[PDB]
Amino acid sequence: QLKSQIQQYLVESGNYELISNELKARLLQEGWVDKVKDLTKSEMNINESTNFTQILSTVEPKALEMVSDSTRETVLKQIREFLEEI
């Protein structure tokens, strides 16, 4: 039916993974990861609980806001290449 259809998806799987790799690099290069670590411990001190779910809700919303402007656009460009492929 569609042997070649199968071929396309492996290229995409390799690209999505590719996109995830490069994103981690920009944030890590920016020390964004180092700031998030500091933010998690700050919220663990502020709140009695050290629970993952309770700590995740306080830290995550702000962390999404924190990502640099340049990182968003570049990754969105790369996500556009991937998205446009299919």
Partner: protein, 32 residues
């Protein structure tokens, strides 16, 4: 109305997943 912007919103969504994964990984490591 190509509504091509809603294809663009899908690109942004994907990004938000990749971000939530990393945020979860970083928070979870410090927890426990």
């Amino acid at each position: 109305t190509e509504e091509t912007i809603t294809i663009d919103s899908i690109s942004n969504g994907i990004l938000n997943n990749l971000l939530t994964t990393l945020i979860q990984d970083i928070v979870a490591r410090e927890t426990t």
